[PDB]
Amino acid sequence: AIRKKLVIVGDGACGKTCLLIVFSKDQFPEVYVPTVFENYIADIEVDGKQVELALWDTAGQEDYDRLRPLSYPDTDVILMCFSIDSPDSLENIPEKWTPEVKHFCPNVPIILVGNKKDLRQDEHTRRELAKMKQEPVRSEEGRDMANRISAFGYLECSAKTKEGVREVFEMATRAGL
């Protein structure tokens, strides 16, 4: 089996931990969500290769932010997340996440991930964003950002419905390889 280190980053509450959990446990967490997922190695088969993915969760609330840069050494692939229900989180991709990741992880491939895709057509989300003269992130905007930061790929998923979750890790593995 091939061994790869994956680091997930992006704005607070954009769904990083839930994404890791749904991929690892095949269940969206109702009941409890930790700030960061437990130390975990996932198994995935991609293109007839067995690979082990160390899943490094990160966060931003006070202490985890200082811990975050210490997590970048020897990363093989980055999941760089924003939430489709948060245009703000998308704008933070070129302003915060890409400068940080490019600094600590030169040459490391990035999968730009649009989380919470289930909220794109959500009435409540649309009404809330409408008061800001905003709307959920369009897939074309996701793609354009991926192009702009020279991501390896752009993917959308919903940890909540599981839609697209497996492909995120499959693409990340292919990049990591």
**Which of Mg ion, ligand GDP, none sits in contact with 175, Cβ below 5 to 8 A by type?**
none
Quote the CA–CA distance of 166 and 163 in Å, as a whole number.
Answer: 8
**Which of ligand GDP, Mg ion, none sits in contact with 33, Cβ below 5 to 8 A by type?**
ligand GDP
Q: Which is nearer to ligand GDP, 2 or 134 (CB)?
A: 134
Quote the CA–CA distance of 14 and 83 in Å, as a whole number.
Answer: 5
**Which of ligand GDP, Mg ion, none sits in contact with 160, Cβ below 5 to 8 A by type?**
ligand GDP
Q: Which is nearer to ligand GDP, 12 or 73 (CB)?
A: 12
Rule CB under 5 A: is residue 115 a binding residue for Mg ion?
A: no
**Angle subtended by helix axes 165-176 and 16-25, to nearest 10:** 90
Interface residues with ligand GDP (CB under 6 A)? 12-18, 33, 115-116, 118-119, 158-160
Quote the CA–CA distance of 51 and 56 in Å, as a whole number.
Answer: 16
Rule CB under 5 A: is residue 125 a binding residue for Mg ion?
A: no
CB 70 to Mg ion: min, Å: 17
For residue 42, the 8-state DSSP code is E
Binding-residue total with Mg ion (CB under 5 A): 3
**Which of Mg ion, ligand GDP, none sits in contact with 6, Cβ below 5 to 8 A by type?**
none
The residue whose Cβ lies closest to Mg ion is 17
Q: Which is nearer to ligand GDP, 166 or 177 (CB)?
A: 166
Report the relative pairing of strands 77-83 and 40-46 from DSSP bridges.
Answer: unpaired
Q: Give all strands (DSSP E) within 37-109, no chain letters.
A: 40-46, 49-56, 77-83
For residue 93, the 8-state DSSP code is I
Structure tokens at 95: 């302003």
- The sheet with strand 110-115 has its strands ordered as 40-46, 49-56, 2-10, 77-83, 110-115, 153-156
CB 123 to Mg ion: min, Å: 26
Rule CB under 5 A: is residue 89 a binding residue for Mg ion?
A: no
Interface ranges with Mg ion (CB under 5 A): 16-17, 59
